[PDB]
Design a protein around this ligand. Structure first.
Ligand SMILES: Cc1cc2nc3c(=O)[nH]c(=O)nc-3n(C[C@H](O)[C@H](O)[C@H](O)COP(=O)(O)O)c2cc1C
Ligand SMILES: Cc1cc2nc3c(=O)[nH]c(=O)nc-3n(C[C@H](O)[C@H](O)[C@H](O)COP(=O)(O)O)c2cc1C
Ligand SMILES: Nc1ncnc2c1ncn2[C@@H]1O[C@H](COP(=O)(O)OP(=O)(O)OP(=O)(O)O)[C@@H](O)[C@H]1O
Ligand SMILES: Nc1ncnc2c1ncn2[C@@H]1O[C@H](COP(=O)(O)OP(=O)(O)OP(=O)(O)O)[C@@H](O)[C@H]1O
Ligand SMILES: [Mg+2]
Ligand SMILES: [Mg+2]
Ligand SMILES: [Mg+2]
Ligand SMILES: [Mg+2]
Lengths: 350, 350
């Protein structure tokens, strides 16, 4: 069997009658599918366990994911190879804890509430990739470090210190958060992983054989930022939000790095500084995207590559050749140093 | 009144008789102190709520913190100004959920277990400072960004890429984690906050008026690393673990920075790059610690300052004067570039 456990938040106020009505329908349908489980609610949070044959469970879960009456859905546990039903008598038992007043329940309710509030806050400070691992039955704190080949992505905002000195603090933070949201959505869609924010820079990585997807993410980010600049409100600082991107490939160490108070599951190795140094080169070029020959040679599609005969990196073992993509964007960009001048003059007047 | 809620982990296996024995004693003592509450256990995790007069609660809690039968104690909620008792009949009610088999309890137990396992894992990926705020009744996700004066601390491991290429991956990670633990313990003891790990670098900050404490942390870190080098086992890579430290002071923005998938409560501003650039200068000097004139001039004790007439920073508005502390360590260090040579030759033979 399969057994799923998830929690979610009310999308809107729901009465006890409305909740009982959801239970009735759930029971009617689960009974037909030979599915059992329990549904609990407390102070605007749903908890549910559902168990049955795998295909049927996936179908039910897809409908539940589409239900507009809850949101912020998070699967806490996905058990496959289940051997015995936990609630064999219950097609769907509904337990509204708001309305319960039993003796021993009362202290458990309070503990359940306090832990849930805490857990839903921590979710926002922790990586989604960590939760997936937990829900698959693995404790990520016990994963051993390993050497692995990756593509490292590094981006940073051009002349950001100008923002921080000409605008109110709420507006500065609003710009960086918009930049970080744009990058995360695209990188995640292309199969990559944002692993660290560093001031105004984004560090992310892709599998060692995904150069195509890292290149595609980079071009889509740059295109998304152009669209944002041209459609921003009059006087918006987003009109002068520009980025540079660098990509490198190499063997890195992946694992739990940190102290006893706080760790991250992240990567370590020379490819990280190489991507950082490449990203910094975009400040002296019209190209907003540069990447190493190792990335270029690992790609499998016929990209419009251009070889930049200006490889003047530092801290490189034996120097590396540098490439970019030649597209309309790059040919119609006025150069990194002139853009920093343009940012100052514009923000000095908003 | 005051009401405390905490969770903890069994330090060792405990029988149901042993647990009931803890309850008996708790009841006897809480009754004398006019304290009430509840104690629950499940699968080796304690949960407790205790409520009463504030001074008495603090005293009870200090004894509980010293009890060697549980560990990993975390306060989830500290309520002051409480108006009504939650458990007025219960000096200390003990509820052993392992032994419970009531109808409606069973599903709640399962949900409580799953959330607790998840919560105790996320704790290790999130900053302790976040939990303190939550336990005081504030949701940190709703704190507004603010401009504030801070001391920024930046440290990094000398010639780390040599470690990563000469040693097995488990040993590389073990070294960086030891470095990060040494720094965190000292910085936290001096009232500072480690906010980010970046590859092999530590970023931390202190209040704007705590230059003395940031300087003291820096000297204690360097002294702790020397002691570690000289007492490491024969052939240990820790014998060639060296660090550089840079400190700067300025106005930064503090708040929630990130995307919708993941944010950090951290800082942003020019003082961060200034401390980074200062830290990098230690690679060309015998000094392992350098800091800006703003830090020097903000300190209130009579430190053995030395003015370094070599201020050749880049990206600085109008250049800055650079200082260090002249002590035995610095005068008996053979210089940054010779140390990187020494690290390679030693690790090439372990
Ligand atoms: C908290 C919550 C839990 C739900 N649990 C179930 C369930 O266990 N089984 C089910 O078939 N539908 C469940 N639903 C409802 C489905 O989302 C969907 O409305 C229903 O399956 C559609 O049935 P219908 O096509 O007959 O109207 C749940 C909805 C909510 C908000
Ligand atoms: C989970 C756990 C919960 C406890 N709760 C209480 C409590 O509520 N009140 C109390 O006085 N001692 C409590 N204790 C025990 C104290 O740690 C300590 O042993 C006791 O107060 C000492 O009493 P004594 O000096 O009479 O031996 C608890 C211990 C554990 C492991
Ligand atoms: N610009 C960067 N941004 C983020 N992480 C970086 C950056 N540069 C390096 N790292 C990380 O730090 C690790 C160590 O690189 P670093 O630049 O500190 O070199 P090093 O060999 O330690 O020499 P140094 O003596 O200059 O500190 C790298 O493996 C990478 O994981
Ligand atoms: N070495 C660094 N390590 C960590 N964070 C840094 C570092 N340098 C800068 N930052 C953070 O990034 C923010 C932006 O600094 P950055 O170096 O990107 O300057 P900038 O004005 O954006 O110019 P550029 O066009 O060179 O990117 C700084 O305010 C600081 O918060
Ligand atoms: Mg920048
Ligand atoms: Mg930057
Ligand atoms: Mg280093
Ligand atoms: Mg480094």
């Amino acid at each position: 069997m399969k057994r799923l456990t998830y929690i979610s938040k009310f999308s809107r106020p729901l009465s006890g009658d409305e909740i009982e009505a959801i239970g009735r329908i759930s029971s009617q349908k689960n009974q037909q599918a030979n599915v059992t489980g329990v549904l609990l609610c407390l102070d605007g949070i749903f908890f549910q366990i559902l168990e049955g044959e795998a295909e049927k469970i996936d179908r039910i879960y897809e409908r539940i994911l589409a239900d507009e009456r809850h949101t912020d859905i998070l699967c806490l546990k996905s058990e496959v190879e289940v051997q015995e039903r936990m609630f064999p008598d219950w097609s769907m038992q509904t337990i509204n804890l708001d309305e319960n007043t039993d003796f021993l329940i009362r202290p458990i309710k309070v503990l359940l509430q306090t832990l849930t509030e805490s857990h839903r806050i921590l979710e926002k400070y922790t990586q989604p990739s960590i939760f997936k691992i937990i829900s698959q039955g693995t404790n990520p704190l016990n994963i051993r470090p390993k050497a692995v080949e990756k593509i490292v992505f590094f981006s940073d905002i051009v002349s950001f210190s100008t923002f921080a000195e000409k605008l109110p603090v709420e507006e500065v933070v609003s710009v960086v958060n918009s930049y970080f949201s744009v990058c995360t959505a695209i990188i995640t869609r292309q199969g990559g992983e944002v692993t660290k924010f560093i001031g105004d820079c984004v560090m992310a990585y892709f599998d060692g054989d995904c150069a195509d997807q890292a290149i595609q993410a980079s071009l889509d980010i740059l295109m998304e930022l152009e669209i944002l600049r041209n459609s921003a409100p009059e006087g918006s600082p987003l009109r002068v939000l520009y980025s540079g991107i660098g990509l490198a490939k190499g063997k890195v160490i992946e694992g739990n790095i940190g102290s006893e108070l706080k760790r991250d599951y992240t990567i370590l190795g020379d490819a990280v500084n190489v991507a950082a140094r490449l990203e910094a080169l975009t400040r002296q070029l019209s190209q907003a995207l540069v990447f190493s020959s190792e990335v270029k040679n690992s790609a499998t599609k016929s990209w419009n590559f251009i070889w930049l005969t200006d490889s003047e990196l530092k801290g490189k073992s034996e120097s590396i050749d540098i490439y970019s993509i030649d597209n309309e964007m790059t040919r119609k960009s006025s150069g990194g140093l002139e853009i920093a001048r343009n940012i100052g003059h514009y923000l000095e007047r908003v």
